[PDB]
Amino acid sequence: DGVGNSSGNWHCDSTWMGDRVITTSTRTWALPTYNNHLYKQISSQSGASNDNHYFGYSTPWGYFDFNRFHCHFSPRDWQRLINNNWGFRPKRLNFKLFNIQVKEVTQNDGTTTIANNLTSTVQVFTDSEYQLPYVLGSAHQGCLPPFPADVFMVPQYGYLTLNNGSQAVGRSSFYCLEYFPSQMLRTGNNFTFSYTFEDVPFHSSYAHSQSLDRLMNPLIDQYLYYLSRTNTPSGTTTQSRLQFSQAGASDIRDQSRNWLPGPCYRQQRVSKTSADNNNSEYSWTGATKYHLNGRDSLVNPGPAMASHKDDEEKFFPQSGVLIFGKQGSEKTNVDIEKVMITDEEEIRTTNPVATEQYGSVSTNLQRGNRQAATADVNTQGVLPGMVWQDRDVYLQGPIWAKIPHTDGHFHPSPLMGGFGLKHPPPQILIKNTPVPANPSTTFSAAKFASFITQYSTGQVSVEIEWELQKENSKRWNPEIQYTSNYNKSVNVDFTVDTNGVYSEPRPIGTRYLTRNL
Amino acid sequence: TWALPTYNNHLYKQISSQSGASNDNHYFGYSTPWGYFDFNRFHCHFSPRDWQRLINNNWGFRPKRLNFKLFNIQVKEVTQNDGTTTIANNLTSTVQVFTDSEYQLPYVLGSAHQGCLPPFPADVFMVPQYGYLTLNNGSQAVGRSSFYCLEYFPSQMLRTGNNFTFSYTFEDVPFHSSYAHSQS
Amino acid sequence: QGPIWAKIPHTDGHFHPSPLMGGFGLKHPPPQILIKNTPVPANPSTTFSAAKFASFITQYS
């Protein structure tokens, strides 16, 4: 309406209506002028090992991301969601940029004077056509903060393309973001846009109560026979005679079964107790990796597979699980106490244990003069009949990821967990329009370099509608729910401390309710 | 985005070659406080990929019509006292823009001058300053020479929050051949 | 990087009037657009004087 009329009203509430939930969240943001308004080509350092080479560009544009779950759900809201629903998925979203502020900083004489600049604008556009490299879903920093009070700084957009070591091959793409029409905003303007997700499978928020190996009736025997005993005693020396039996409660390991567990790419096992772990630098030499174009790249998290067998909560895969940092953790080489290691015991009923080999298979044709030998399989590709559980999603965890535009993707659900969308919410890019300082009275063709220093601030609000699959269990005994501890503590969980620092103490995964296979 | 200074301290000036200059290099004309827009270079409109798309695929092309817009106008004031420069908005002040649709002004376009809207979109450019040449006899100007006051032309005045748009349609012209003959 | 058009000179005779730099020789080319900041006068003297102003407020747009 006018310079002195607010663009929007602050919204943060979650409202539940039957099997639908709407979670709205509003944040204030600040956006600097990145790269001094210049596109830059960036690449790895000459020294960097060949596995670490890269080539790309850094852009003056800043983008919005809200791909972390806590951006939309509050701990209580999350509790309400997991305890009560078997499944959920995102339906549609609303996004708004309002109360835009552009300010000017005068830094002469060592004292900084900040004042409004009502005239200057911010360019915002959404890449609804996906002609830009998608940098979302790579678990980058800068999410709309978990806590509403906190103010956050908009991340800076950059992208990587093909490279031959330091050098860039002919095929590499350089994109000018400006080439895209972007709406320009002044103070007192707003930018809104709406998106509807594609139909996607509900993410299971349940943990199976029946293991795959155990699906049969304990009381009745099968009618199919298996090879019970290969040889039988003949006087003193045993003789080769084949004998068959019907599997029953007594020999459950032998029952015929229709289904097979999920695929397994094996991991290395490291323990939370320092003592167990070997005294050597095997962080990389001992890690599980894949190879693309001559570069070994660590496979983290990797295919969903249970982290540990029974009574081995102590162990966890080297790079087979998600690991979040406790609030205040620094960037490099933090101790174990400074992170939170996630735990996937729930999928063990149908998924293999990441550390253990998938199975055993016989590799030689036996005969009278040749014993029967078999070999372990550390890496099993999907075989017909397999069933598995996709990786869990956590409150601090990612929500979606763009399925790569390729001829073939199989079971394209992001390995970090989340919803694999073909057309994900478009990247939103915002940049302060550059404003030139006092120019020279005499003409000069060279481009400007003396811009007026500027920064812009304002509120951002994202609303998402989520559909729910209400729990319908007829189990008799009570189930397991998520509860905060009854005991007294110097700080309550999920709350600001004495100095006003919000902190998520533990990771919360969606699998507490249980259903049968 | 563009920036426009105050040329010639707001004064029309008569300019001519230097006394020393050889007779081939003499000229006489005027320099005006006005700055003009030019976009007569191809890269102003086409991006390298766009250009590639155009040449590979078409035998000929020509311009049909154009749309031009001046928006988000900003006028600022510089206070330079005490060696520290303070720049601040001046919402009241205006910019005069007019198009010479009647061609009563010497046409300085098409002479391959500098100042084109930059090839690259990110770059900010400085508006060129308008001047023109007329008849001359060595350093001196003959009676026939024309002095034009640009202000004599009605020009719309803009403030911050105003815009100026106008549209033009080219005349029919022959397509420029983008082919090379395969037969001598 | 080359030029797009050029104004055919207003003369009785031009033959094959296509600009030698290459481009499209138009009779009526896109009109020149001229833009100038309106001059703003600084604090004037309280006593009248017919001489024209010279103390303008420095400006850029």
Short mmCIF file of N, CA and C in Angstrom, two decimals, chain B residues 5 22 41 44 49 68 99 102 112 136 141 147-148 172 176:
data_model
loop_
_atom_site.label_atom_id
_atom_site.label_comp_id
_atom_site.label_asym_id
_atom_site.label_seq_id
_atom_site.Cartn_x
_atom_site.Cartn_y
_atom_site.Cartn_z
N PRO B 5 25.95 10.92 -14.71
CA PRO B 5 26.44 12.10 -14.01
C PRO B 5 25.83 13.38 -14.54
N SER B 22 46.35 18.56 -37.66
CA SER B 22 46.45 18.60 -39.11
C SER B 22 45.08 18.82 -39.74
N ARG B 41 24.93 -2.44 -30.37
CA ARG B 41 25.85 -3.56 -30.52
C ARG B 41 24.99 -4.79 -30.33
N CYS B 44 24.41 -6.71 -26.91
CA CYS B 44 23.49 -6.10 -25.95
C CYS B 44 22.22 -6.92 -25.81
N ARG B 49 25.20 -18.21 -26.21
CA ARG B 49 24.38 -19.36 -26.56
C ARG B 49 23.24 -18.96 -27.48
N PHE B 68 11.10 -0.31 -25.06
CA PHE B 68 12.14 0.30 -24.25
C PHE B 68 11.52 0.85 -22.98
N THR B 99 12.72 11.14 -26.39
CA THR B 99 13.17 10.47 -27.60
C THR B 99 13.02 11.40 -28.79
N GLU B 102 11.53 12.45 -34.29
CA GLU B 102 11.38 13.17 -35.54
C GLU B 102 12.69 13.35 -36.28
N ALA B 112 29.61 3.39 -34.24
CA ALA B 112 30.37 2.44 -33.42
C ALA B 112 31.04 3.03 -32.20
N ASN B 136 32.51 22.99 -40.67
CA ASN B 136 33.62 23.74 -40.16
C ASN B 136 34.58 24.16 -41.25
N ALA B 141 33.94 27.99 -37.53
CA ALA B 141 32.67 27.43 -37.96
C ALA B 141 32.00 28.33 -38.98
N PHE B 147 23.47 24.82 -34.43
CA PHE B 147 23.60 24.69 -32.99
C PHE B 147 22.22 24.29 -32.52
N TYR B 148 22.13 23.17 -31.83
CA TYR B 148 20.85 22.67 -31.37
C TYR B 148 20.73 22.68 -29.88
N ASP B 172 10.22 -2.34 -43.07
CA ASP B 172 10.58 -3.57 -43.73
C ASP B 172 11.98 -3.41 -44.30
N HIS B 176 19.28 -10.18 -43.31
CA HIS B 176 20.70 -10.23 -43.45
C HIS B 176 21.05 -11.69 -43.61
#
